[PDB]
Write an enzyme that holds these catalytic residues in place. Structure first.
Site, short mmCIF file in Angstrom:
data_model
loop_
_atom_site.label_atom_id
_atom_site.label_comp_id
_atom_site.label_asym_id
_atom_site.label_seq_id
_atom_site.Cartn_x
_atom_site.Cartn_y
_atom_site.Cartn_z
CG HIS A 1 12.79 -48.48 -46.33
ND1 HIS A 1 13.16 -47.16 -46.15
CD2 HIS A 1 11.67 -48.46 -47.10
CE1 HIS A 1 12.29 -46.37 -46.77
NE2 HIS A 1 11.38 -47.14 -47.36
CB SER B 1 10.51 -45.03 -49.83
OG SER B 1 10.05 -44.91 -48.49
#
Ligand SMILES: *[C@@H]1O[C@H](CO[C@@H]2O[C@@H](C)[C@@H](O)[C@@H](O)[C@@H]2O)[C@@H](O[C@@H]2O[C@H](CO)[C@@H](O)[C@H](O)[C@H]2NC(C)=O)[C@H](O)[C@H]1NC(C)=O
Ligand SMILES: *[C@@H]1O[C@H](CO[C@@H]2O[C@@H](C)[C@@H](O)[C@@H](O)[C@@H]2O)[C@@H](O[C@@H]2O[C@H](CO)[C@@H](O)[C@H](O)[C@H]2NC(C)=O)[C@H](O)[C@H]1NC(C)=O
Lengths: 99, 218
Positions: free
Chosen positions: B41, B173
């Site tokens: 992502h 992330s």
């Protein structure tokens, strides 16, 4: 030093027939919680939809449209956030959908 | 990383910063001199031709001469499911091979299929938010975490800090989860905001992908 990012709001199939936009800082890496804060404010200000009303809606999402043609769909009732940052100058538009 | 500490200078020489127009936005792990591993992502919506891969960094606000900076040449995914946040892993091939030295080194991965039991002690790290309201970290942060299996799912590795509000945050992330010297997770998503203390942070489970990662380096 700021940029306008256009948005649209759809509530129960009815739009708003308006041209309006949000103000971001140019070329800043922001989170999807930053974006959520701005989507919620336009919901309240343009459609009278508060936090309580958003929680009680059947479905509530918004889509970030990116300039390279991709998009990302966020569920406003999920409480899940990817731990990334995205750059404000890469965003084409935001569309909000509340049914 | 909310509620961690600063890492020692260059204590994790596989730690990578992915940057866009000079600004950090996601972490990664160096898994070969010309390959890094991150979260799918992180790149699903960026112009990947514009990502700078910064190795050997510690303080992102400076001009450290220990840095090696690469561009992304190709990406490899394997079943990424954005709707359900399954298989949230990407391998980025670099436009060159890094020089290996004390500041830049390749990470070690577990055997294929190794699962981590409840209670295992791990170390998360990253350059993410120091806490909402407080802004992005300049100096790499690390955080002790424990693997948990409650409020999780089998297709993720989840981790929790108990007794205080702490966890990964925005910008973390793609950063590695290190357990027993091996990269066992890639930071993927949080539930109920950063460092809630209720819900464990969710990582992509690297051990499920080892045979695939190996096939890509060949
Ligand atoms: C691999 O690419 C790096 C990075 O290139 C820069 O960043 C890219 C994202 C893209 O925006 C490019 O146009 C940039 O130049 C190269 O590092 C650059 O090398 C050139 C020549 O040595 C130098 O002028 C730049 O200043 C360097 N940029 C940085 C950030 O250090 C690197 O040379 C490439 N490697 C190979 C083997 O070609
Ligand atoms: C917090 O973690 C540090 C770092 O250890 C790493 O993460 C662990 C959870 C585990 O994955 C280790 O294998 C990793 O190396 C812990 O520091 C270690 O402590 C042990 C016991 O004293 C010591 O033998 C090691 O040398 C230490 N390693 C390093 C790199 O300093 C620390 O104990 C953890 N804190 C708590 C409260 O558990």
């Amino acid at each position: 030093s700021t940029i306008q990012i256009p948005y649209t709001i759809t509530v129960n199939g009815t739009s708003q027939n308006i041209l309006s936009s949000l103000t971001f800082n140019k070329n800043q890496n922001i989170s999807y919680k930053d974006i959520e804060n701005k989507v919620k404010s336009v919901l309240y200000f343009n459609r009278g939809i508060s936090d309580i009303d958003l929680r009680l809606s059947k479905q509530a999402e918004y889509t970030v449209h990116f300039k390279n043609g991709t998009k990302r769909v966020i569920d406003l009732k999920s409480g899940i956030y990817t731990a990334d940052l995205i750059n404000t100058s890469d965003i084409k538009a935001i569309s909000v959908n509340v049914d | 990383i909310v509620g961690g500490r600063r890492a020692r200078p260059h204590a994790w020489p596989f730690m990578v910063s992915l940057q866009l127009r000079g600004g950090h936005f996601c972490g990664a792990t160096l898994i070969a001199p010309n390959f890094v591993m991150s979260a799918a992502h992180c790149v699903a919506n960026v112009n990947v031709r514009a990502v700078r891969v910064v190795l050997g960094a510690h303080n992102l606000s400076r001009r450290e001469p220990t840095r090696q900076v690469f561009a992304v040449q190709r990406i490899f995914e394997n079943g990424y499911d954005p709707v359900n946040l399954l298989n949230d892993i990407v391998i980025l091939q670099l436009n060159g091979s890094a020089t290996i030295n004390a500041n830049v080194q390749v990470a070690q991965l577990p055997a294929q299929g190794r699962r981590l039991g409840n209670g295992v002690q791990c170390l998360a790290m990253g350059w993410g938010l120091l806490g909402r309201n407080r802004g992005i970290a300049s100096v790499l942060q690390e955080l002790n975490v424990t693997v948990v299996t409650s409020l999780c799912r089998r297709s993720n590795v989840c981790t929790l800090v108990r007794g205080r509000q702490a966890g990964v945050c925005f910008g973390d992330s793609g950063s590695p989860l290190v357990c027993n010297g091996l990269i066992h997770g890639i930071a993927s998503f949080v539930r109920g905001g950063c460092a809630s203390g209720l819900y464990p942070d969710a990582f992509a489970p690297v051990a499920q992908f080892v045979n695939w990662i190996d096939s890509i380096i060949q």
